């Protein structure tokens, strides 16, 4: 027996106990070793409830990046409402590692293996965990990268789908590499490398699994319209420096159109910050090549309102919410307690 219950968790990982890397130094005396010997039990023939949109793990693991960040990468200037903090901000050597989220005795992790699952709603193979898998904490925007891919159809994720307003999460189950790199000795003129024939190909899937939860209709797809840097570029930050790239290119519907595509990319140092408050300035780039090869897993749309009385659809890339980051991830576990 459980009851759906919240609690408060402990982290694993595997971090090399000497790396300076930030994530492994975070990890060492933040997170207990990986179980070496963990299990999973099949609840036979159980059927348990989940929801993706409404998880505290969610939130647990936002309190746990938001914490790494800010022990790790902290910026030269802090403009957070007025009171701007002058100090430290050495270079650093980033890349995250994956973490495990355990619970403590009392409770367990439900993990939903259906391969279909669309994050909410209800699960039929239901198997007991105690520690989750490890999860790559990825900041970035508009593009998932680093993490899982669907194990069968292209999964489309969202609160109500019928709610414009409400972020949509395509889970990808191929993915498209892209890579971005800063040319060795204009230091923040940067861009990200993408094969444009497996991109239009996942492109257009997308399409075709967009119209079946649409009433198949037309469509279309948009650069975001306004709003922060951050977001109307796939903002993302690599070897430490934050790379901002125009994902213009990717979200025209122009598809001779299927070479290298080149996205142009800028090195920014002040960053409209993710974890909340306000802006931060950074250093300069580091010399040398800034290069960073990432799988994209997933998107961030946001579909445009108002089109009920037209005949399509139009969506536009988001981001922003690194809660909906994680929550790529954590669809599939959700904390119950053992009463
Ligand atoms: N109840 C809560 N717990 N809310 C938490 C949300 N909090 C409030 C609102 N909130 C924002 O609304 N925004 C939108 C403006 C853009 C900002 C950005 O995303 N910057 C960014 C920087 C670097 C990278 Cl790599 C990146 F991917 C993104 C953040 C902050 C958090
Ligand atoms: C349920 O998930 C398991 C993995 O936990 C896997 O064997 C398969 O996808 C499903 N198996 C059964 C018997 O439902
Ligand atoms: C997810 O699947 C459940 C199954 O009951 C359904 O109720 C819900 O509307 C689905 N959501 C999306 C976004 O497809
Ligand atoms: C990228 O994707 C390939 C296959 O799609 C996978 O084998 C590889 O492990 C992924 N790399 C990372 C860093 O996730
Ligand atoms: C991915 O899902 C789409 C449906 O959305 C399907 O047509 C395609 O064959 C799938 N590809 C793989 C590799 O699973
Ligand atoms: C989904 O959003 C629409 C539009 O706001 C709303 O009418 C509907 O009630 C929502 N669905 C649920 C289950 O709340
Ligand atoms: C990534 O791009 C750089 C610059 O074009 C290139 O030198 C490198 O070989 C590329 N790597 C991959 C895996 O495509
Ligand atoms: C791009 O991807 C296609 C299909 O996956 C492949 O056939 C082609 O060789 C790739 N192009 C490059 C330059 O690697
Ligand atoms: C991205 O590039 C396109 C075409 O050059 C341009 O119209 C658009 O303004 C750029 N995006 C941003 C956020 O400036
Ligand atoms: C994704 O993983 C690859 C290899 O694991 C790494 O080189 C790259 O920096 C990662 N991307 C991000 C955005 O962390």
Same mark, same amino acid.
């Given at each position: ?7 408060? =968790? %402990?982290?694993?990982?595997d971090?090399?106990?000497?790396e300076?890397?930030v994530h492994?130094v ?12 963990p299990?999973? !039990?099949? *609840? ?21 990046? !938001? ?12 403009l957070?409402?007025?009171?701007? @903090?002058?100090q ?8 995250? @590692?994956?973490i ?8 367990? @992790?439900? /993990? ?23 999860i ?24 109500? *789908? ?5 972020? !949509?999460?395509?889970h ?34 997308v ?12 469509? @279309?797809?948009?650069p ?6 951050? !977001?109307t570029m796939?903002? %993302?930050?690599?070897?430490?420096? %934050? ?6 290119? =990717? ?8 070479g ?5 990319? /800028?090195?920014?140092?002040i ?16 010399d ?12 961030? *749309? ?31 576990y959700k ?5």
């Amino acid at each position: 027996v459980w009851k759906d219950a919240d609690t408060t =968790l %402990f982290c694993a990982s595997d971090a090399k106990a000497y790396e300076t890397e930030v994530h492994n130094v975070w990890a060492t005396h933040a997170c207990v070793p990986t179980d070496p010997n963990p299990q999973e !039990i099949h *609840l036979e023939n159980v059927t348990e409830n989940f929801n993706m949109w409404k998880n505290n793990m969610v939130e647990q693991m936002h309190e746990d990046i !938001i914490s790494l960040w800010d022990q790790s990468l902290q910026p030269c200037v802090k403009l957070t409402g007025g009171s701007v @903090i002058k100090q430290a901000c050495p270079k650093i050597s980033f890349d995250p @590692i994956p973490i495990h989220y355990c619970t403590p005795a009392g409770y367990v @992790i439900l /993990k939903c293996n259906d391969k279909n699952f669309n994050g909410t709603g209800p699960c039929k193979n239901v198997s007991s965990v105690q520690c989750t898998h490890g999860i790559k904490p990825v900041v970035s925007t508009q593009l998932l990268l680093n993490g899982s891919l669907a194990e069968e159809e292209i999964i489309i994720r969202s609160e109500n *789908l019928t709610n414009n307003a409400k972020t !949509i999460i395509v889970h990808l189950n191929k993915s498209v590499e892209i890579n971005c790199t800063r040319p060795s000795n204009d230091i923040r003129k940067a861009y990200c490398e993408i094969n444009g024939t497996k991109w239009n190909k996942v492109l257009k899937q997308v399409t075709e699994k967009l119209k079946e939860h649409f009433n198949n209709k037309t469509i @279309i797809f948009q650069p975001p319209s306004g709003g922060d840097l951050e !977001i109307t570029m796939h903002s %993302f930050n690599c070897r430490g420096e %934050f790379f901002y790239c125009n994902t213009t290119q =990717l979200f025209n519907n122009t598809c001779g159109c299927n070479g290298t595509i080149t996205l142009p990319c /800028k090195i920014k140092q002040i960053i409209n910050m993710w974890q909340g408050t306000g802006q931060a300035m950074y250093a300069p780039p580091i010399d040398g090549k800034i290069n960073c090869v990432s799988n994209i897993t997933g998107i961030l *749309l946001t579909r445009d309102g108002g089109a009920n009385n037209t005949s399509n659809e139009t969506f536009r890339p988001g981001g922003g919410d690194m809660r909906d980051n994680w929550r790529s991830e954590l669809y599939k576990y959700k904390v119950v307690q053992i009463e």
